[PDB]
């Protein structure tokens, strides 16, 4: 049992670790090529013991064996052991706040997947590039209405994912503090009773949204949920709501981290901000690269079914693994100077949307969001730059940027 070094192990599972974002970095270089699959043991006992799996190859395999590596047992994202306990209490038991798509496992996983599968491809999204470009169009006038400054996060980043996915899934414009609430505070980075009260409003609010969605359907993806039947039968309302959860809360701050660290390679590059601006087709491979550079999500976690082995390491059944995205995306074994913001790097080669049968269902969805968003941006601004220092947050699951100020001049 090859051992993290204790400096790592402290590291790895602290949300400012990922603010900081440099240091990480480093001492994942030193333990992925010693130890890619090795086991963090807390000195005194505040999170159960998990295998940290840091190189490309590990996650990849990992992510693909399915059916050795599940997402239900054990809590999907890290968690120390008080945490657990407060999901617990909330639930009645299980590790899981709401049992979505991303906490199952087959059986029940692929048919609730299969359900949007068409909905997310490339071929019907192109059928929203209008309601899309309206809504970016609208995130760069707040951007422009506040002068020649500003924060690109308050401003563009952060609110544009979730009207995007708002949107998609017929949620009023009122109902947005709500949805803010939603991916802000319950998830992202006696208070147990507010919370389970909260979830339970939550359900009761999307099972009614769906009610309307099966009088009135549309081409959104609200309706291809609300619709659905699974084994002859419609959805309960926990698995309803449950599917409108997960679209929102992973839609929304993933897809603002990797907006956010594409405008700030743009505003740091201006050679490449120009190319950009000539020529569109060179955006393609921007997006891929902000996604992989910034690594919204940085790690999930999977438990072993049986006993197995990665990266030649054992691994035995029951123990709880970490996949670091971070680690895997700057791993030099796939990535030339895994460091540097590189747009001609290829698509569809990084771990930032993982791989499997739990591979990102959003994916066409952000790349396309994200590309949008730049182009309004590109035709908008003769110029962009940095007016201050961009801050990363503070959390072990999503990250993305706290603050960015900037300073532009309106074409
Ligand atoms: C840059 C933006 C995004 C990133 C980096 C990202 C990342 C990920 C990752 C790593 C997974 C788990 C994959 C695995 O376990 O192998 C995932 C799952 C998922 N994502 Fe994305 N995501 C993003 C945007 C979106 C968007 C915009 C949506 C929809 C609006 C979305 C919907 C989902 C759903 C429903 C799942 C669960 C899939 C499943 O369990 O089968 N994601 N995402």
Same mark, same amino acid.
């Given at each position: ?190 208070? =147990?009773?507010?919370? !389970?009260? @909260?979830? /339970?409003?939550?359900?009761?609010? &999307? %099972?009614?949204?769906? *009610?309307? $969605? ?44 990797? =907006?956010?660290?594409? !405008?700030? @390679?743009? /505003?740091?590059?201006?050679?490449? &901000? %120009?190319?950009?601006? *000539?020529? $569109? ?131």
């Amino acid at each position: 049992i090859p051992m993290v070094p204790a400096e790592v192990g402290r590291a790895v599972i602290d949300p400012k670790s990922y603010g900081t974002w440099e240091p990480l970095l480093d001492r994942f270089d030193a333990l992925r090529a010693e130890a890619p699959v090795a086991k963090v043991v807390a000195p005194d006992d505040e999170h159960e013991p998990f295998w940290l799996v840091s190189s490309f190859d590990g996650v990849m395999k990992a992510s693909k064996d399915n059916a050795t590596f599940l997402n239900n047992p054990k809590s999907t994202v890290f968690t120390l052991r008080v945490g657990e306990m407060m999901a617990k209490a909330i639930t009645g038991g299980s590790p899981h706040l709401v049992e979505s798509l991303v906490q199952m496992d087959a059986p029940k996983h692929p048919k609730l997947r299969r359900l949007t599968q068409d909905w997310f491809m490339p071929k019907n999204l192109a059928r929203l590039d209008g309601e899309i470009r309206k809504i970016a169009n609208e995130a760069i006038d707040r951007m422009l209405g506040a002068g020649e400054e500003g924060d690109f996060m308050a401003l563009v980043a952060a609110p544009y994912p979730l009207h995007v996915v708002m949107q998609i899934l017929g949620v009023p414009p009122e109902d947005e503090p709500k949805m803010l609430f939603l991916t802000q505070q319950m998830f992202g980075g006696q208070i =147990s009773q507010i919370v !389970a009260g @909260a979830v /339970a409003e939550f359900e009761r609010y &999307f %099972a009614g949204l769906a *009610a309307e $969605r099966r009088r009135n359907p549309t081409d959104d993806v609200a309706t291809v949920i609300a619709n659905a039947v699974v084994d002859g039968e419609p959805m309960s309302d926990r698995d309803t709501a449950g599917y409108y959860i997960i679209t929102a809360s992973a839609g929304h701050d993933t897809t603002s981290a990797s =907006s956010a660290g594409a !405008a700030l @390679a743009l /505003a740091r590059d201006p050679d490449l &901000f %120009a190319r950009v601006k *000539a020529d $569109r087709n060179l955006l393609p491979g921007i997006v891929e690269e902000a996604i992989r550079w910034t690594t919204p999500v940085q790690h999930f976690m999977r438990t072993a079914a049986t006993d197995t082995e990665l990266c030649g390491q054992k691994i035995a059944a029951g123990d709880w693994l970490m996949l670091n995205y971070v680690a895997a995306n700057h791993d030099p074994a796939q990535f030339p100077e895994p460091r540097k913001f590189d747009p001609t790097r290829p698509a569809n080669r990084h771990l930032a949307f993982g791989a499997g049968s739990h591979q990102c269902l959003g994916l066409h969805l952000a790349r396309l969001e994200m590309r949008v968003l730049l182009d309004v941006l590109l035709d908008r601004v003769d110029s962009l730059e940095l007016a201050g220092e961009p801050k990363r947050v503070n959390s072990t699951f999503v990250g993305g940027f706290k603050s960015l100020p900037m300073r532009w001049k309106a074409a």
